[PDB]
Amino acid sequence: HWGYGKHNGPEHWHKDFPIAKGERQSPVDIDTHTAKYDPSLKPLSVSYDQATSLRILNNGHAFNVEFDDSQDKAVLKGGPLDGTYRLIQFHFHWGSLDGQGSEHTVDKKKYAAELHLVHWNTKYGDFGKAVQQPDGLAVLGIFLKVGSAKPGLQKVVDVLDSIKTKGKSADFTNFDPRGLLPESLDYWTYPGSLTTPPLLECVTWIVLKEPISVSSEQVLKFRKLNFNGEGEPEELMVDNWRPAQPLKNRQIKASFK
Ligand SMILES: CNC(=O)Nc1ccc(S(N)(=O)=O)cc1
Ligand SMILES: [Zn+2]
């Protein structure tokens, strides 16, 4: 089964998921000098005040904080998007060392981690249908650098002990994802894919320019998670990131000058 090891990592994925070598794969390097300001891009609208978090799950690849997406409670609109995209889950990708971990890079710079807030287009009715469409998902990507702690992350950090291993979940209600955002909503955007198998080319990527800061202690706790299930040999959940893929026939647009 696919993963992030030497024998099942990103360089192997194409054998089971041939779209890995497709025309709009993610992540990518964001060359800041080549991205073009697009004045026709509208401000992002992040409407999370009514978000209902439910649960946190270690799925063997990352941990997902899941939300109630049966109504328009936490939605992303505007920017490059047509229509309304409902928040279903967020998760992170991170490194074994502070110098790597992000999936997108910025002028080849790797951040310590990257947060993905995953949303699906309500015109397709459910998430499983949305991933089959070229405009099915909108993923809001936020870089993490190590410095000061992010207070709004701590409730996530402190539950990780209870979901150490693959398949474990815990109740995770009343978590406010607004506490994970940076100050500015300036962003880059481009058409891409899921960054894990099945690698479907269904994502409008919206990557914020401003990183959030998290503390060394916070990221160290991410690195205590396990890829393995309970009672299996311990393999630390680290370096669960796909490297940058060829941009091919795509333009990255900037919301800002
Ligand atoms: C239930 N399946 C599911 O959520 N798959 C999924 C979602 C998002 C991403 S990412 N890394 O591109 O944001 C990858 C896989
Ligand atoms: Zn992701």
DSSP letters, 111-153, are PSEEEEEEEEEGGGSSHHHHTTSTTSEEEEEEEEEESS--GGG
Contact 247, 104 (CB under 8 A): no
Integer Cα distance of 74 and 105 in angstroms: 27
Residue 175: give the domain boundaries.
1-257
Going through the chain in order, the beta strands assigned E by DSSP cover: 29-30, 36-37, 44-47, 53-58, 63-67, 75-78, 85-94, 105-106, 113-121, 137-146, 169-171, 187-192, 203-208, 212-214, 253-254
Integer Cα distance of 124 and 130 in angstroms: 5
Residues having CB closer than 6 A to ligand 1 are 116, 118, 139, 194-196
Q: CA separation (Å) from 124 to 77, 127, 133, 135, 197?
A: 15, 8, 8, 10, 21
Q: Which of 43, 36, 23 is nearest to 184 (CA)?
A: 43
Integer Cα distance of 65 and 70 in angstroms: 16
Integer Cα distance of 56 and 66 in angstroms: 6
CA of 242 to the centre of ligand 2 (A): 9
CA of 33 to the centre of ligand 2 (A): 25
* 196 annotated ligand binder: yes
Contact 62, 194 (CB under 8 A): no
Choosing from 1, 12, 61, 119, the catalytic residue is 61
* 105 annotated ligand binder: no
Contact 96, 18 (CB under 8 A): no
For residue 44 the two structure tokens come to 């992002």
Number of domains in the chain: 1
**27: Cα separation from own chain's centroid:** 10
To what resolution in angstroms was this structure determined?
Answer: 1.3
The experimental technique used to determine this model is X-ray
CA of 149 to the centre of ligand 1 (A): 26
Neighbours of 239 (CB within 10 A): 16
Residue 12 annotated as catalytic = no
Ligand 1, atom 12: nearest CA belongs to which residue?
A: 194
Neighbours of 133 (CB within 10 A): 15
